[PDB]
Amino acid sequence: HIDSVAPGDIRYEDLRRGENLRFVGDPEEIHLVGSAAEIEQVLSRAVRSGKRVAVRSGGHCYEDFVANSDVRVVMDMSRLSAVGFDEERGAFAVEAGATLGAVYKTLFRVWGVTLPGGACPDVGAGGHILGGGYGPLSRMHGSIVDYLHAVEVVVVDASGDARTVIATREPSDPNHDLWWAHTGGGGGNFGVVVRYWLRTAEADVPPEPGRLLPRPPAEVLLNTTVWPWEGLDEAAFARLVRNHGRWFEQNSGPDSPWCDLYSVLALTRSQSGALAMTTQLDATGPDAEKRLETYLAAVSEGVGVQPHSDTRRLPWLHSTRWPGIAGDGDMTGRAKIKAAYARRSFDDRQIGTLYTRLTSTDYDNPAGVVALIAYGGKVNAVPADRTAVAQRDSILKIVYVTTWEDPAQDPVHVRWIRELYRDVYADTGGVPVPGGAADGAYVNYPDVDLADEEWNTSGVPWSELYYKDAYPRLQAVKARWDPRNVFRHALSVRVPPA
Amino acid sequence: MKHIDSVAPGDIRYEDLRRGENLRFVGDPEEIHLVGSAAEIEQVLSRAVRSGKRVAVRSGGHCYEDFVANSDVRVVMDMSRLSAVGFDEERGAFAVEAGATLGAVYKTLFRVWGVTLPGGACPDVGAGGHILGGGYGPLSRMHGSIVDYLHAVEVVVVDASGDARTVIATREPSDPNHDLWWAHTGGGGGNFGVVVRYWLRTAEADVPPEPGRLLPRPPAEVLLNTTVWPWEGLDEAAFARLVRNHGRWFEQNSGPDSPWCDLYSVLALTRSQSGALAMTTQLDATGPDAEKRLETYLAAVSEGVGVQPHSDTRRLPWLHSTRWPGIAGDGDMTGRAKIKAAYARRSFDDRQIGTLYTRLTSTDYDNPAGVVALIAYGGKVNAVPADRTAVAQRDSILKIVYVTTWEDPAQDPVHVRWIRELYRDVYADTGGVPVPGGAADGAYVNYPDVDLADEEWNTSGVPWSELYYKDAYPRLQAVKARWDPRNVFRHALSVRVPPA
Ligand SMILES: *Cc1cc2c(nc3c(=O)[nH]c(=O)nc-3n2C[C@H](O)[C@H](O)[C@H](O)COP(=O)(O)OP(=O)(O)OC[C@H]2O[C@@H](n3cnc4c(N)ncnc43)[C@H](O)[C@@H]2O)c(*)c1C
Ligand SMILES: *Cc1cc2c(nc3c(=O)[nH]c(=O)nc-3n2C[C@H](O)[C@H](O)[C@H](O)COP(=O)(O)OP(=O)(O)OC[C@H]2O[C@@H](n3cnc4c(N)ncnc43)[C@H](O)[C@@H]2O)c(*)c1C
Ligand SMILES: [Cl-]
Ligand SMILES: [Cl-]
Ligand SMILES: [Mg+2]
Ligand SMILES: [Mg+2]
Incomplete structure (x- = not known):
């Protein structure tokens, strides 16, 4: 008191x-x-x-x-x-x-x-x-x-x-x-x-x-895989996104043996020099290292760029503070974030849009990223109506982010991420309309643009994107x-x- | 309970x-x-x-x-x-x-x-x-x-x-x-x-x-600066002028009555393999001329060096500033490291600066992660009599950290030897260790280094205990x-x- x-x-x-x-x-x-x-x-x-x-x-x-x-x-x-x-x-x-x-x-x-x-x-x-x-x-x-x-x-x-x-x-x-x-x-x-x-x-x-x-x-394998942007053409980029999307389409059921796997695929601006993926797998079960390998091989299969891959093994609590999982603890910049649920992986048009926006020279910022976050598994064993988290059949959460330093530049960064996200969702009014390829968005990554008639032209209100029924x-x-x-x-x- | x-x-x-x-x-x-x-x-x-x-x-x-x-x-x-x-x-x-x-x-x-x-x-x-x-x-x-x-x-x-x-x-x-x-x-x-x-x-x-x-x-608020000098086209004379400028600055501005008691900085003397030397500086932002004072310090460090630093300054409220990675570090404890430490009562002499240049540019070693960090110190620490606490070093101007970091345990011998030989050579005039009461004042026990108790590495005749605690x-x-x-x-x- x-x-x-x-x-x-x-x-x-x-x-x-x-x-x-x-x-x-x-x-x-x-x-x-x-x-x-x-x-x-x-x-x-x-x-x-x-x-x-x-x-x-x-x-x-x-x-x-x-x-x-x-x-x-x-x-x-x-x-x-x-x-x-x-x-x-x-x-x-x-x-x-x-x-x-x-x-x-x-x-x-x-x-x-x-x-x-x-x-x-x-x-x-x-x-x-x-x-x-x-x-x-x-x-x-x-x-x-x-x-x-x-x-x-x-x-x-x-x-x-x-x-x-x-x-x-x-x-x-x-x-x-x-x-x-x-x-x-x-x-x-x-x-x-x-x-x-x-x-x-x-x-x-x-x-x-x-x-x-x-x-x-009790212990986890942690892998950092990095593909150099200099080696990735659009077809390479597309193959990689497609490989990953298919793998998560196949392996995110609540009874899947891959519920013990987590990964984040960071589709970075080419200006950053490298595309990156962080993977965590339970290390304790039979054949953990081979199973990790079979996921990594799937992602890079036929991509034609050999990724740089390193795997460490850590006790679980120590693992949680590895920056590859925890992030860098740097909140001193400025950022605008956007989010979506994916029920299916990006289609051909969306992958092309992402390629264009990440390799664009009309924008200058190495810090833009679209992160694809492994999702589903046991989340999807729960009926949609049981809790106020209605999205119980998605395979990925998608985070769209750009970060910068100078407040005078806020309008430029905010426009870039808005146009990227609107163009990925262009078939559905600029937004991840629920119950289709997408399933709306998640409220821990709020985006007031989902309530803005300038950016959401889908006729689906912000409240349905976050909460559905x-x-x-x-x-x-x-x-x-x-x-x-x-x-x-x-x-x-x-x-x-x- | x-x-x-x-x-x-x-x-x-x-x-x-x-x-x-x-x-x-x-x-x-x-x-x-x-x-x-x-x-x-x-x-x-x-x-x-x-x-x-x-x-x-x-x-x-x-x-x-x-x-x-x-x-x-x-x-x-x-x-x-x-x-x-x-x-x-x-x-x-x-x-x-x-x-x-x-x-x-x-x-x-x-x-x-x-x-x-x-x-x-x-x-x-x-x-x-x-x-x-x-x-x-x-x-x-x-x-x-x-x-x-x-x-x-x-x-x-x-x-x-x-x-x-x-x-x-x-x-x-x-x-x-x-x-x-x-x-x-x-x-x-x-x-x-x-x-x-x-x-x-x-x-x-x-x-x-x-x-x-x-x-x-x-x-209540601080200015925080990151300054970076590219290693490419920074030659020995340039390195030396930088280290000497910084050293002289801390010799003159680290008394307990100094107006610069509100400045902290760490100068990272990195391996040339890393691509850049770097320095992080914090200054109280709440007084009248804070921007200008920061620039005066930075200008002194770079004076006559002939390599233009990249410099960026931000201002933050105090608690937020403490978690900025420039001050807090990166939170990554997943690697392997060997650390050594020394008090400096005076800054590095010409011989030591030369040894540092050699060791940090060496192509006989391969690791971009080696650093000698010079940490601003003294000020109000040195207002306290040397016998009042069990911290006996109350007249130093800098703390120095020698560190190398790596991943593979199979390589432990190689990195451990590099940092041992670097440290020994910097302290060669006094038995490979920072003997107290001279240009150095021993070491500080929060960065312990068991080599100080090893007759193979410590040839000064001063025991580990006197290095940490003096009298x-x-x-x-x-x-x-x-x-x-x-x-x-x-x-x-x-x-x-x-x-x-
Ligand atoms: C900055 C940051 C956010 C992250 C990070 N990683 C996440 C992750 O790995 N998974 C996630 O699902 N979410 C991640 N997030 C986002 C956070 O989950 C959201 O940003 C949370 O909303 C943050 O919660 P909190 O830190 O408490 O933030 P506040 O700003 O204090 O509150 C947010 C919001 O909720 C209201 N509120 C706070 N406290 C209460 C209580 N006690 N009762 C009711 N309402 C409360 C606030 O008023 C505000 O409306 C990683 C990073 C680095
Ligand atoms: C990893 C790390 C260390 C740092 C960092 N930054 C520092 C800084 O900015 N200034 C500093 O002065 N020191 C910094 N250090 C070094 C740490 O200060 C030392 O490493 C401390 O000794 C760490 O203390 P703690 O984290 O509690 O480490 P432990 O390993 O648990 O203990 C160290 C030592 O002390 C004995 N001990 C622990 N607890 C007690 C109690 N309750 N009673 C008596 N003795 C205790 C231990 O047994 C062991 O001998 C930045 C980073 C990232
Ligand atoms: Cl209460
Ligand atoms: Cl955090
Ligand atoms: Mg924080
Ligand atoms: Mg930690």
Whole structure:
């Protein structure tokens, strides 16, 4: 229970931002909240005053949802970073301010378990878990939301009063639909998550903590494969994308033996000098090294460029902080990200578009990338309607990103990535319309352009791209638990016009 | 704060937990205990002492030598559960548990109280093995050594009877355990007992008992510069002028009263195979002429060198700046490395600069990853008398790191020999080591190098102990005799009592 941070405080330049430096907030106060009770009193005071609020956990939002200049009061979750096992509830409690790196280190070193969350260690649990997401173990263990047993959330009723509710996976729980909205609803929509409780949904299980969350593979093979751009012509490039697409089309079923494989294929600007792929395979099973080889051979088969390939073997927890998996921890640039689900691999026109845009000399930036992220496996064993992650038959997530340094150049980079993504999706109004080759987009990589009639000409609204048929049930949760629409932003769940 | 099962061979965690972060060393411990409390640590030590089993503690795992992962160690106490950071109102000081990483310490101290500690720049280093060894970081020149803030330490020690007990030792001179406190202001890890938690606060007398005033404030915003000089067409005279410019600058601008106490930089003298020499610089941005002052430093380093540097400067809020890889490093501990270290009281002489040029351009070696890094130091570190803590080096201007990195264990001999011969040749005038009290001032124990205790590599007649501790060593030996009389806590560079 401590002083809030206001302009003039030594901490204000840090705390008025998240990790995305494109967005600089102007809040009057940032509250380092310490408990559900404190969050109730901050929210109720702000609601009484008519002041716009937002929550910051890990600060990784790709859009201006927290740092929007309209936000007056931020609740920053940094003090709430506990991770542990709640004996009373029989589940792991992860408070919203815990980073994923701290979650994986504690769960694994202490109990030998993990969650199939994201790969960046500094991401906050608070804005990540409730939006679903992907990570290296999604194929092996399913989505992180498949582990959400309960959620503690501070909500604001019609009167303006704040209160804390615990909502659970039990369907007769009066707050069951509020728990369901936290299985992929996304941050900044329903209320302030204080903590999540995570546990397997299996009925079998003795209630010992080491049995109650999935085990990672004990060691993994990690490969870095790099093809020089100087050696790749369009036909080569196309063959490689096609090989990879076919392989993921064949080998992403929930019963596939390849659920233990994860990879990221980085289709980089040719200006970068090299195309690259990072692969992780469980190293513990019979024939791991040969199986890794047979995946790598498939990707490069008939490409006519010999890739540079190196494989190391690491114990699992050490593996998670290898930069090839974790990324480089550099958030000091400016970036614009876009995203899509792929149900099938890129077609011939799309591959040609990608080739053109990545080799273009009308643009100058080595940092543009289209990353194809191995997906499906056990994520796809879950029926589409079970959680608020409705996309349960995709084979890849696709990330489109460009990064740069100079803010005067924002319009150039933002236009390039917008035109690239619009042209890849040109047959469907510039966007990855669901239930076809694509399956919409995923809310942890929000893109306000999906709501912009200038860029989305498909007639399919942003809410259907992220949530497909889950959206009506999410709107009902919104109407019931945030009737005043306290929690909102450029892509927030909104009730139907009245 | 309950005990849980220990981790033995067969356990899914054993491959991770038998290692620290330096992959050259793989422990063969029988048991790794994820200790939850001091009482638990007492039980594990007691048991190990009775059965004659060798112990070591692992906090953040960043040890550069085999002190924890030595195949002789049978029982490891792993501090991962003890990672709290907070303000302890019982003592009026900030408590940092041994298992907390520096990243977590800086994020908590600064977001919650607006304060910090002038410790190391790598966020994943653990408090446990770091703070008691002293060390350096970006704010050393501004705020002095992290040990200058050590108020008290909770440590589990083993008596001659082999009973284990927990003691709190403080900076209070009348404390019966004062000497044990002192040995934790630089005596280094793995020597006296198991640190459970440290308490930190300013020693200032005229300070109100509020947390936000009890530790130093960082500069609210900093300028951060990357400068790069291409190696192609940088000849020996050019290299030499660069190293000499930088050296003279630090000779003149590293006193405790210097206005340049708010500057930190690291100059990386890289292998020419790498393609570029590089320098990273941080400067407080909040004062009137910060841009211009930064340019003055950069212009001094490049003056008359004749190779135009590529230079880019960004400005960040302080906490964000700490995670910029230019300052924090790259977070990649997956390779193999051998490191060596020295204090510099003066900058490199002409002979040493020539040896550096030869070694870094050599085509008899093949590795672009060799570096000699020159780290800005002194400033407010040198305001403290040499005898006040167990960090005896209080008049140096630079710390120097010699490092080589590689991948294949089959090549260990080759990289190890390269860095040994480089270091020996730079220090050839004094027995291949940085002998204290001269152009050098010994080495610092957070970058331990067991070759300093090897008569094959150290031909100066000055022992490893004097290189690390100078005249603090006798008082360290008294503390060792008093609090670890059985010599439970030991390794290749551990404090040892005199021969009997
Ligand atoms: C920067 C970054 C993001 C990544 C990275 N890797 C990912 C990966 O491997 N898989 C993924 O699925 N996602 C990855 N992401 C994206 C992140 O998952 C998203 O950026 C998350 O939304 C980030 O969460 P968090 O760090 O907490 O960011 P915030 O900016 O604080 O919040 C985002 C959003 O959610 C709301 N919110 C925060 N906290 C709460 C609580 N407690 N209750 C309700 N709502 C909350 C915010 O207000 C905002 O709306 C890798 C990298 C490097
Ligand atoms: C890998 C790494 C090391 C760095 C980095 N950056 C540094 C910097 O910017 N400034 C520095 O001064 N030092 C830097 N270092 C070096 C680290 O400071 C040292 O490597 C520290 O000794 C690391 O401490 P820790 O991570 O806790 O390492 P451990 O291997 O667990 O222990 C080292 C040593 O100390 C003993 N020990 C650990 N814990 C205890 C306790 N609780 N009580 C007593 N003794 C303890 C161990 O047994 C071992 O002997 C940047 C990078 C990337
Ligand atoms: Cl609470
Ligand atoms: Cl990260
Ligand atoms: Mg970060
Ligand atoms: Mg690390």
